[PDB]
Motif scaffolding. Structure first.
Motif, PDB file in Angstrom:
ATOM      1  N   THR A  66       0.824  -1.205   0.000  1.00 39.20           N
ATOM      2  CA  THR A  66       0.000   0.000   0.000  1.00 39.20           C
ATOM      3  C   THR A  66       0.861   1.258   0.000  1.00 39.20           C
ATOM      4  N   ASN A  67       1.972   1.239   0.742  1.00 38.94           N
ATOM      5  CA  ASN A  67       2.877   2.385   0.747  1.00 38.94           C
ATOM      6  C   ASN A  67       3.406   2.683  -0.651  1.00 38.94           C
ATOM      7  N   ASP A  68       3.561   1.654  -1.485  1.00 37.08           N
ATOM      8  CA  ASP A  68       3.906   1.887  -2.882  1.00 37.08           C
ATOM      9  C   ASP A  68       2.717   2.431  -3.663  1.00 37.08           C
ATOM     10  N   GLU A  69       1.499   2.011  -3.307  1.00 40.41           N
ATOM     11  CA  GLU A  69       0.311   2.591  -3.924  1.00 40.41           C
ATOM     12  C   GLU A  69       0.057   4.005  -3.422  1.00 40.41           C
ATOM     13  N   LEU A  70       0.426   4.292  -2.170  1.00 40.57           N
ATOM     14  CA  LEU A  70       0.287   5.642  -1.639  1.00 40.57           C
ATOM     15  C   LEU A  70       1.250   6.624  -2.290  1.00 40.57           C
ATOM     16  N   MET A  71       2.286   6.128  -2.974  1.00 42.60           N
ATOM     17  CA  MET A  71       3.282   7.012  -3.573  1.00 42.60           C
ATOM     18  C   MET A  71       2.641   8.000  -4.540  1.00 42.60           C
ATOM     19  N   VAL A  72       1.617   7.563  -5.275  1.00 38.82           N
ATOM     20  CA  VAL A  72       0.916   8.463  -6.188  1.00 38.82           C
ATOM     21  C   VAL A  72       0.274   9.608  -5.414  1.00 38.82           C
ATOM     22  N   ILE A  73      -0.211   9.328  -4.202  1.00 42.66           N
ATOM     23  CA  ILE A  73      -0.762  10.385  -3.362  1.00 42.66           C
ATOM     24  C   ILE A  73       0.336  11.350  -2.930  1.00 42.66           C
ATOM     25  N   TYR A  74       1.509  10.823  -2.568  1.00 45.13           N
ATOM     26  CA  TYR A  74       2.634  11.692  -2.242  1.00 45.13           C
ATOM     27  C   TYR A  74       3.091  12.490  -3.458  1.00 45.13           C
ATOM     28  N   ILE A  75       3.003  11.901  -4.653  1.00 43.52           N
ATOM     29  CA  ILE A  75       3.361  12.627  -5.869  1.00 43.52           C
ATOM     30  C   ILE A  75       2.392  13.779  -6.108  1.00 43.52           C
ATOM     31  N   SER A  76       1.113  13.582  -5.773  1.00 45.76           N
ATOM     32  CA  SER A  76       0.132  14.646  -5.955  1.00 45.76           C
ATOM     33  C   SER A  76       0.459  15.865  -5.103  1.00 45.76           C
ATOM     34  N   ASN A  77       1.109  15.661  -3.956  1.00 45.92           N
ATOM     35  CA  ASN A  77       1.517  16.776  -3.112  1.00 45.92           C
ATOM     36  C   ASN A  77       2.792  17.448  -3.606  1.00 45.92           C
ATOM     37  N   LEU A  78       3.550  16.791  -4.487  1.00 43.26           N
ATOM     38  CA  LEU A  78       4.756  17.405  -5.034  1.00 43.26           C
ATOM     39  C   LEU A  78       4.410  18.622  -5.882  1.00 43.26           C
ATOM     40  N   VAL A  79       3.491  18.453  -6.834  1.00 39.98           N
ATOM     41  CA  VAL A  79       3.094  19.563  -7.692  1.00 39.98           C
ATOM     42  C   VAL A  79       2.191  20.530  -6.938  1.00 39.98           C
ATOM     43  N   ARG A  80       1.315  20.007  -6.074  1.00 36.99           N
ATOM     44  CA  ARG A  80       0.384  20.862  -5.344  1.00 36.99           C
ATOM     45  C   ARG A  80       1.112  21.860  -4.454  1.00 36.99           C
ATOM     46  N   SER A  81       2.301  21.502  -3.964  1.00 40.78           N
ATOM     47  CA  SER A  81       3.103  22.460  -3.209  1.00 40.78           C
ATOM     48  C   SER A  81       3.451  23.671  -4.065  1.00 40.78           C
ATOM     49  N   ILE A  82       3.717  23.449  -5.353  1.00 36.13           N
ATOM     50  CA  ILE A  82       3.944  24.565  -6.263  1.00 36.13           C
ATOM     51  C   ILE A  82       2.619  25.185  -6.698  1.00 36.13           C
ATOM     52  N   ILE A  83       1.562  24.375  -6.827  1.00 36.97           N
ATOM     53  CA  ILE A  83       0.244  24.918  -7.147  1.00 36.97           C
ATOM     54  C   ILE A  83      -0.211  25.881  -6.059  1.00 36.97           C
ATOM     55  N   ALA A  84       0.038  25.534  -4.795  1.00 31.17           N
ATOM     56  CA  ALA A  84      -0.213  26.478  -3.712  1.00 31.17           C
ATOM     57  C   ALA A  84       0.682  27.704  -3.833  1.00 31.17           C
ATOM     58  N   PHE A  85       1.905  27.524  -4.336  1.00 32.00           N
ATOM     59  CA  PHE A  85       2.775  28.658  -4.620  1.00 32.00           C
ATOM     60  C   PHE A  85       2.353  29.384  -5.891  1.00 32.00           C
ATOM     61  N   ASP A  86       1.675  28.690  -6.809  1.00 30.39           N
ATOM     62  CA  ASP A  86       1.172  29.349  -8.009  1.00 30.39           C
ATOM     63  C   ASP A  86       0.106  30.383  -7.674  1.00 30.39           C
ATOM     64  N   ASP A  87      -0.587  30.214  -6.546  1.00 31.69           N
ATOM     65  CA  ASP A  87      -1.504  31.247  -6.081  1.00 31.69           C
ATOM     66  C   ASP A  87      -0.768  32.506  -5.651  1.00 31.69           C
ATOM     67  N   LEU A  88       0.500  32.383  -5.253  1.00 34.25           N
ATOM     68  CA  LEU A  88       1.311  33.550  -4.931  1.00 34.25           C
ATOM     69  C   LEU A  88       1.773  34.297  -6.174  1.00 34.25           C
ATOM     70  N   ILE A  89       1.732  33.657  -7.345  1.00 34.78           N
ATOM     71  CA  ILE A  89       2.049  34.356  -8.588  1.00 34.78           C
ATOM     72  C   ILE A  89       1.051  35.481  -8.825  1.00 34.78           C
ATOM     73  N   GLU A  90      -0.241  35.145  -8.841  1.00 34.81           N
ATOM     74  CA  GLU A  90      -1.270  36.170  -8.966  1.00 34.81           C
ATOM     75  C   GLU A  90      -1.275  37.088  -7.751  1.00 34.81           C
ATOM     76  N   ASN A  91      -0.972  36.538  -6.572  1.00 30.96           N
ATOM     77  CA  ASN A  91      -0.911  37.353  -5.363  1.00 30.96           C
ATOM     78  C   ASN A  91       0.169  38.421  -5.460  1.00 30.96           C
ATOM     79  N   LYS A  92       1.292  38.110  -6.110  1.00 31.60           N
ATOM     80  CA  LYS A  92       2.343  39.102  -6.292  1.00 31.60           C
ATOM     81  C   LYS A  92       2.018  40.069  -7.425  1.00 31.60           C
ATOM     82  N   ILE A  93       1.347  39.593  -8.475  1.00 30.32           N
ATOM     83  CA  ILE A  93       0.947  40.480  -9.564  1.00 30.32           C
ATOM     84  C   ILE A  93      -0.112  41.466  -9.087  1.00 30.32           C
TER      85      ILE A  93
END
Lengths: 105, 400
Positions: A66-93
């Protein structure tokens, strides 16, 4: 047609709990009727009931896998960390707009 | 002025032979009788000190090291005023008569451009760029601007000044950006990378040298194979081994270049031995590299020991990728190092995060650290991921 006559993520999760209690309330009420007092003629249906339980209702044998199946869930947080930072792009503009308002004022 | 720049460059550091500075000093006294090299030798004692700085007869009174042959005798001392009368009193009076008679326009500009080349051999740099500025207003087409950017580039080449010269080199292309042919378009970008080698920007400036030296050479200052050693050493230095097979080892110019002279020993001995993954014969080729290439060359000796730290970590890194686990008897008992002497090379590389390797001190089994599926997706992502909020909150928390 019926939509005109009648007339997000948190609401979609509300129906999930209603389905969880459906698993609980359907089995407890039915199984308690076959056992204890007043046994009906059965074991024909029991074969289909236990067919769901074999495959925390499913499998603990995949816990290591299951921990190997959970890896996809951990991968989803890899980009989402930048997606949460992508909200700072418009926030800075949008910071330039109010800074421009202070110049016009 | 490349002859006095390349040969007398050995006056900085030569640990190989004593006659290297003596043989190169003959070309300094031979070329100075024609054109005045005096401002070049005066700067040699004002740059590096307590080595060759005491060989000048009159700067301060000193005698030291091994070289009595570099000096201005009673002949060149009397010729100091003779060359000044010909390069100033004689030339300025002929050009002054052109402005009074009003003869031509670009012809008068070329007079100040040709006269400006003498100020490089004078040693007054205030009048060097002033005469070029007088011809700048008279320059119309790009034909007269060719020798202007060459004389300004000599100010950093002849005087070894990378500070004030790079400002004038960039001022020509920034004010009016044209470039004409792609040949000159690479010349403005070549002089940009030259002053960046003094501050050692590594692969940024050095990547343009292998492209320019493999196509066209100015041929006025030097030959094709004389400065070809700069691109031969920096060719494998900057470029990764993956692209060495389609570029360096197979090239139309480079493979015909090794037949010109044996003084390279880079694009042939070092490239073939590195592509064959054989480090037994690769290392002894490096013995004649620094001595006969890096030391005599100017821009290469500006780095010298700066090459190996990048190269020494790379040669073993490519070997670690071909095997999961190596053996100590291959590194210690065979090619480039002994047992105890191995701790000096790879010992300082790992704490600098240059490479990841494991050496066994008991059984002698070398182990390689492989990131496998991690790479930059997991570990390196955390490192450079913190820079998102670091650079944003740096100047962002203070508003305006």
């Amino acid at each position: 047609g019926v939509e005109h006559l009648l007339r997000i993520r948190l609401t979609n999760q509300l129906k999930s709990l209603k389905g969880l209690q459906s698993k609980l309330k359907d089995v407890v009420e039915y199984l308690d009727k076959v056992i204890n007092k007043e046994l009906p003629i059965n074991h024909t249906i029991l074969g289909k009931l236990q067919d769901v339980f074999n495959l925390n209702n499913l499998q603990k044998a995949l816990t290591v896998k299951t921990n190997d199946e959970l890896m996809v869930i951990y991968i989803s947080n890899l980009v989402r960390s930048i997606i949460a930072f992508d909200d700072l792009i418009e926030n800075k503009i949008q910071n330039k707009k109010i800074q421009e308002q202070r110049v016009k004022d | 002025n490349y002859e006095v720049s390349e040969k007398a460059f050995l006056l900085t550091q030569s640990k190989v032979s004593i006659e290297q500075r003596k043989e190169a000093a003959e070309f300094v006294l031979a070329k100075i009788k024609e054109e005045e090299m005096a401002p070049y030798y005066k700067y040699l004692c004002e740059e590096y000190l307590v080595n060759n700085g005491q060989s000048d007869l009159e700067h301060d009174e000193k005698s030291d090291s091994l070289n009595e042959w570099i000096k201005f005798d009673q002949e060149l001392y009397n010729e100091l005023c003779k060359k000044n009368e010909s390069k100033i009193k004689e030339l300025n009076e002929k050009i002054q008569k052109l402005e009074e008679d009003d003869e031509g326009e670009l012809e008068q500009a070329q007079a100040w451009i040709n006269l400006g080349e003498y100020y490089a051999q004078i040693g007054d740099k205030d009048n060097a760029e002033k005469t070029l500025g007088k011809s700048l207003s008279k320059a119309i087409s790009t034909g007269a601007k060719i020798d202007v950017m060459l004389t300004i580039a000599r100010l950093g080449f002849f005087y070894n000044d990378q500070l004030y010269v790079k400002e004038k080199l960039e001022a020509v292309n920034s004010m009016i950006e044209k470039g004409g042919d792609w040949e000159r378009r690479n010349r403005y970008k070549t002089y940009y990378g030259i002053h960046c080698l003094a501050v050692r920007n590594f692969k940024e400036a050095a990547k343009l040298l292998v492209d320019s030296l493999a196509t066209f050479t100015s041929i006025e200052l030097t030959s094709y194979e004389s400065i070809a050693t700069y691109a031969s050493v920096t060719g494998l230095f900057t470029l990764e081994r993956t692209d060495l097979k389609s570029k360096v080892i197979d090239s139309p110019e480079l493979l015909s270049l090794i037949s010109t002279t044996a003084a390279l020993q880079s694009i042939s001995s070092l490239t073939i031995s590195l592509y064959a993954s054989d480090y037994a014969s690769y290392f002894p080729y490096l013995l004649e590299t620094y001595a006969n290439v890096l030391i005599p060359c100017k821009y290469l000796n500006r780095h010298a020991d700066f090459f190996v730290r990048e190269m020494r970590r790379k040669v073993y890194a490519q070997l670690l990728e071909s095997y999961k686990t190596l053996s100590l008897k291959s590194m210690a008992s065979a090619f480039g190092v002994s047992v105890a002497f191995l701790d000096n090379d790879l010992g300082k590389f790992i704490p600098n995060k240059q490479l990841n390797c494991v050496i066994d001190r008991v059984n002698g089994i070398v182990e390689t650290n492989r990131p496998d599926n991690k790479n930059a997706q997991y570990h390196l992502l955390v490192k450079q991921g913190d820079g998102l909020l670091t650079k944003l909150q740096k100047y962002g928390a203070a508003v305006r």
